[PDB]
Amino acid sequence: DSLGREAKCYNELNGCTYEYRPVCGTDGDTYPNECVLCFENRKRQTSILIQKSGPC
């Protein structure tokens, strides 16, 4: 099934803000905000989900 939820890019056209609102990815890595995880998934064609909010 899934071990979390899909990371959204919040209608960001080119990039994300530097808002610090950390999410824990299903890879065990902290992403500074959800949107850099969404663009990371777009650029690498990966499917890291969000386990939960907060740092890992």
Dihedral (CA of 36, 42, 45, 47) sign: positive
Method: X-ray
**What is the pairing mode between strands 23-25 and 50-53?**
antiparallel
Domains of the chain: 1-56 (3.30.60.30)
Resolution number, Å: 2.3
Can you list the pairs that 16-23 forms with residues at least 24 positions away whose Cβ atoms lie under 8 Å? 21/53, 22/53, 22/54, 22/55, 23/50, 23/51, 23/52, 23/53, 23/54
3-class DSSP string for 5-42: ECCCCCCCCCCCCCCCECEEECCCCEECEHHHHHHHHH
Rounded Cα distance, 45 and 52, in Å: 21
